[PDB]
Structures are given as structure tokens and as C-alpha cells.
Paper text:
The P1 domain is the phosphate substrate domain, P2 interacts with response regulators, P3 is the dimerization domain, P4 binds ATP, and P5 interacts with CheW.
Sequence alignments of Td [name] with [name] homologs from a variety of model bacteria with previously characterized chemotaxis systems indicate that, in Td [name], an additional ~50 residues join the canonical dimerization domain (P3) helices. Interestingly, aromatic residues (Phe, Tyr) cluster near the helix breakages, and unusual core packing of these residues allows for maintenance of a coiled-coil register despite a disruption of helical heptad repetition in the C-terminal helix. However, a linear arrangement of [name] is present that generates “strands” of rings interlinked by the [name] dimerization domain (P3). Because of the high membrane curvature, the receptor trimer-of-dimer modules are expected to be further splayed, and the elongated P3 may compensate for the increased distance between receptors and P3.
Residue numbers in the entry:
A (entry chain A): 5 to 129
B (entry chain B): 2 to 129
């Protein structure tokens, strides 16, 4: 066999180990993203329960003549942040998907090269 | 200008086959996470619509109770908005966790295969 053909196979395996390292890093990124979603989900579900449980106190104040605008001020000040409870989940997720897709596609390219290269040595008599 | 063992080349073929299988599984995991991103985006839009509606309704509904509206209808509608909001992402947390678990499994398998490929390809090289 050609010496340079075997050195190409060694270089492809080197590319595989690097791609393996990047894919491992991607598993950690997606585990972190799962944790972030799970935490934000539990937090919003807990906080929205607290909001509903607060409503009778707001009613008591209104019944005593408290300004409804002050109630609105209290509600929005405490609870409007619910809108952002997931933080940067979506942008972090999109970036992690893009990075994972690139590494996975590169692995496909390497594996195709490995397949054809080793298959062509299997064809030498 | 190199000599290689035929049987070791067939062994490397089986390692490359395992690599291709793992790659196909990793590709499906990229699609799974892309689907989950899209699902999060769609459900997050609904989540914000529902949260804005609940926040707007609460002071309005307090005023309506004071104006003499049927209080049960107010309580019921708040609870109905609240349960819709609690369920807006459905089983996303479980689906995301399962997707991470599958990806971790295939990634670890790739690490094992890559170690075997490294030793396998280096040992086919014989002199003269």
C-alpha cells in the first residue's frame, strides 16, 4: 500500500478525536440548557402560584379603598419579570445547536473519508 | 510502499462501520434539538401572550369584583388562565432531558470508538 494513503487515514483519525472532544463539550452545553429550562419552569410555576395566592390580599386592599393603580404598580413590579424567566435559553440553545450541527456534519465528512479510504485498501490484492 | 495485515483492515472496517452508525445517531440528535428549539420558540410566544393576559386581567378583575360582578366567574377565569399558563410547555422538560441523555450516550460511544480507531490505524503500519 501507498505510505501516503495510510498517513491520510492517521490524519482522519486525528480529526475524529478532535471532533469527539468538541461533541463532548456540546453534551455539557445541552445538559446546562436542560438545567436552565427545568429551573426556569419550576420557578415560573412556583411564582405564578404565589401571584394567584396574592390576589385576595390585593382584593382586601381594594375593598378598603386602595388605589387600583397602586395595585397595578405592585403587580407589575413584582411579576412582570415572569415574561423573561427563561432568560437567554433560546439564544444559548440556538448557538449550541449550530455548534453541534457543524461538528456532527464534520464527523459525517470524516467518516465518509474513512470509509472510502479503508475500503480502498480492502481492495488491494 | 507499506505492508498491512488484511485481517486488521477488516477489523478497521467494523470500527468505521460503528463510527458511521454513531454519526447517523448524532445527526438525528441535531435534528431533535433543532425541533426542541422550534418548540421552545413557539411555546415561549404563547407563554408570553398568556402571562401578559394574566397580568392585565388581575387588576381589571379586582375592579370588576368591586363593581359587583359575579365573583365566581372572576375566580374561575383567573384559575383557567393560570392552568393554561402552567401547561404551556407541556412535557418539554422531559423531552429535552431525554434528548440530552441520548446525545450523551452516542457521544460517549464515539469516544470509545475513536480510541479504538487510533490504536487500530496505528498498528496496521508494518515494516518494511
Amino acid at each position: 500500500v501507498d505510505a501516503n494513503r495510510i498517513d491520510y487515514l492517521l490524519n482522519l483519525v486525528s480529526e475524529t478525536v478532535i471532533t469527539k472532544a468538541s461533541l463532548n463539550q456540546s453534551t455539557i452545553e445541552f445538559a446546562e440548557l436542560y438545567d436552565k429550562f427545568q429551573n426556569s419552569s419550576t420557578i415560573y410555576k412556583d411564582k405564578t402560584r404565589r401571584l394567584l395566592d396574592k390576589m385576595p390580599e390585593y382584593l382586601e386592599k381594594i375593598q378598603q379603598g386602595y388605589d387600583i393603580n397602586s395595585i397595578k404598580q405592585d403587580v407589575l413590579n413584582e411579576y412582570s419579570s415572569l415574561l423573561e424567566v427563561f432568560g437567554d435559553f433560546d439564544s444559548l440553545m440556538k448557538a449550541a445547536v449550530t455548534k453541534f450541527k457543524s461538528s456532527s456534519q464534520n464527523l459525517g465528512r470524516i467518516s465518509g473519508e474513512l470509509q472510502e479510504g479503508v475500503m480502498k485498501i480492502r481492495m488491494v490484492p
